[PDB]
């Protein structure tokens, strides 16, 4: 889910970069390094709050190196998927094993085992869809899904969902 959390990053600056725009270089290097990133400790990091005055502190010169080590402290918005949490999403793909639903920046793979027996896959339809007697779940279709399993991949977090519970599925 979405939170805002206090994060600190250590940035090393070469001696050549200590011009009057040191603050701007530090702030720009904070961006493009943590903005839109993924980690197992804090989930996704989407954006930084309170950019007007980011706490850069002083910055310590590494001895025998000359590079300065800054501990920049900031507020960051985080989207950490959690086990057994219900969130809305948009279905983007369907397959035999399950269907991939777009939740925020991540894709949740809901397996076919975690749906009521009335909902059945149909690859004959173009695009293939998880179709039921009462409704059809196609591309760009809303669905509320309870995430129950998350595997921590630094490159891109992966999650497994379910809609077996009551009032879980297409809205």
């Amino acid at each position: 889910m979405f939170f805002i959390k206090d994060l600190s990053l250590n940035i090393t600056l070469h001696p050549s970069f200590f011009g009057p725009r040191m603050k701007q270089y530090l702030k720009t290097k904070l961006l493009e390094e943590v903005e839109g990133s993924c980690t197992g400790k804090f989930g996704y990091i989407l954006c930084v709050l309170d950019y007007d005055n980011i706490d850069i502190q002083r910055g310590r010169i590494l001895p025998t190196d000359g590079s300065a080590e800054f501990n920049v402290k900031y507020r960051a918005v985080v989207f950490k998927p959690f086990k057994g949490e219900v969130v809305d999403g948009t279905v983007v793909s369907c397959s035999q094993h399950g269907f991939e639903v777009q939740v925020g920046p991540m894709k949740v793979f809901v397996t076919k085992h975690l749906m009521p027996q009335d909902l059945t896959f149909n690859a004959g339809s173009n695009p293939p869809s998880y179709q039921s007697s009462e409704d059809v779940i196609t591309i760009k279709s809303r669905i509320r899904v309870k995430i129950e399993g998350c595997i921590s991949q630094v490159s891109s977090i992966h999650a497994i969902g379910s809609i077996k519970e009551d009032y879980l599925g297409a809205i």
Binding site: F2, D6, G36, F42, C47, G84, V86, P105, C150, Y167
Partner: protein
């Protein structure tokens, strides 16, 4: 301490075991402690919009779904540059699944949930998911079970649904 290797309970939102660093209270950058405020989808959307517009103003000095998508794309390209596929997807997701519109309604919702005196994660989950009835909301969010009375939850969800706009 410094325990080599780690033994801990598996994360579970229903059990409210969000994580060792997602506890109820967190130390702010000022040195004091603040309750871990959890953002619902609308509140998080407003926070993201405020942060992005403030960044755009700083860089300058130094509604329908389609037009909102175009506006967020333009503002995203103006504020930040590349490696924003995740942020673009999150922003379009937020513009899609937004429960509240502007500052007034989100402020009313946040103060009303604050009056409930419930867990920040639970109130954020209440604001995030647009339910219909009381027991349906309880079964949607297992962390809501046996935390507040049925009548009080029903009435507060009635006010939430009244505050639900567009």
């Amino acid at each position: 301490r410094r325990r080599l290797k780690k033994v801990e309970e598996e994360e579970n939102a229903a059990t409210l075991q969000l994580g060792q660093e997602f506890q109820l209270k967190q130390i702010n950058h000022q040195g004091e402690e603040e309750e871990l405020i959890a953002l619902n989808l609308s509140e998080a959307r407003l926070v993201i919009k405020e942060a992005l517009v403030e960044r755009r103003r700083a860089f300058k000095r130094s509604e329908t779904r389609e037009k909102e998508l175009e506006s967020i794309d333009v503002l995203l390209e103006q504020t930040t540059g590349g490696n924003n596929k995740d942020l673009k997807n999150t922003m379009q997701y937020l513009t899609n699944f937004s429960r509240f519109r502007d500052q007034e309604t989100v402020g009313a919702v946040i103060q009303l949930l604050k009056s409930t005196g419930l867990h920040p994660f639970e109130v954020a989950q209440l604001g995030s998911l647009a339910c219909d009835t009381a027991d349906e909301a309880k079964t949607l969010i297992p962390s809501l079970n046996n935390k507040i009375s049925d009548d009080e939850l029903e009435r507060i969800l009635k006010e939430l649904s009244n505050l639900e706009t567009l």
